[model samples]
Target: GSLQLWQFLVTLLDDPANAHFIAWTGRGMEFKLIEPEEVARRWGIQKNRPAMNYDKLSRSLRYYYEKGIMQKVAGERYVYKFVCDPDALFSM
Candidate 1:
């Protein structure tokens, strides 16, 4: 009831320490999970779901598209772009 998954991702990207696992793609709010499995694993741990995998993680990400939160990069793997003005939405 506190932070959504997208907010969790914003937290990760806001921290320089997490760049190794996930970082911006230098195209506005676009970013790619350099270590998607590690990212998913961590998300699972945060959500207390040890069985989480990229398949399930990605499915949740897909839902955001319908909400105009994020969208997949065209013909790109492990890449996505925030659909809204992130600075206006999250201030980072």
Candidate 2:
């Protein structure tokens, strides 16, 4: 699979046509699904799981945390950052 779920989501953010649904939070790999339900619904359609919802969709993204591919921003209930570059994304 050349593209993973998260990567595909990134593509949506990069595509201006999907600006209404998702967008980058900054110049980094960070972003958010402004329309999370819609995002989940689309993902459900993409993955063939029509039952996808925010809770389930979020749970799916959580898997990335363990792989250093993603991180949830503190105090932002629905914000997240892609941690592909830990050195810059996080100031350790």
Candidate 3:
């Protein structure tokens, strides 16, 4: 894979076209996958996994928690607060 999950996710976050599927919360580095199923479908397209769904995709997200790459917003469904620097990550 050219980009891993977190990188791929940020790429989508940077793209205006993907806003409906995923978008920034305007709260610093926080973001929400508003349409998680659609986001998962798009991820499947990139990863060549046609069987992708939020369940499986979210599991991958869980791995990032341990790595300190991402954290779920408390009491927020489908929301995540990024730990990495989005500006720096996108620039690099």
Candidate 4:
């Protein structure tokens, strides 16, 4: 597979637009971007189940970071904060 293929896969896996908005509002952190075990414990998601796979969430977040939608603020603990865009506005 080429770089484009990986990019495509990552883009497909991550809904960056949605994640971007969430991050912009500081709500992304609340959505549990940690490991599956931790996410399950915090969100009451069943362990060993489909929803417990935080790998997907982590990948999406990494994608967002690469796309410049979010940035790692606290690298020691892998904490992240969204880069703000004053011109950003949501529309229905």
Which ranges in model 2 have alpha carbons more than 4 Å from their true place?
Answer: 85-92
Between prediction 3 and prediction 4, the one with superior lDDT is 3
Model 1 is weakest, by summed lDDT over 10 consecutive residues, at 83-92
lDDT tens digits by residue: candidate 4, 1-92: 33332233223225555342222224443232333344323222322235533455466557877886666655334355555431242332
CA lDDT for candidate 4: 0.41
Model 1 lDDT at residue 87: 67
Candidate 1 lDDT, 24-70, residue by residue in tens: 88989999999998889989988888898888999889999878899
Candidate lDDT scores, in order, read 0.88, 0.78, 0.89, 0.41
Candidate maximizing lDDT: 3
Model 3 scores worst on lDDT over the 10 consecutive residues at: 83-92
Q: Taking the tens digit of each residue's C-alpha lDDT, what string does model 3 give over 1-92?
A: 47688878989999999998899999988999999999999899998998999999998899988889899999999999889885786685
lDDT for 20 (candidate 2): 86
- Predicted candidate 1, C-alpha RMSD: 2.0
Question: Which wins on TM-score, candidate 2 or candidate 3?
Answer: 3
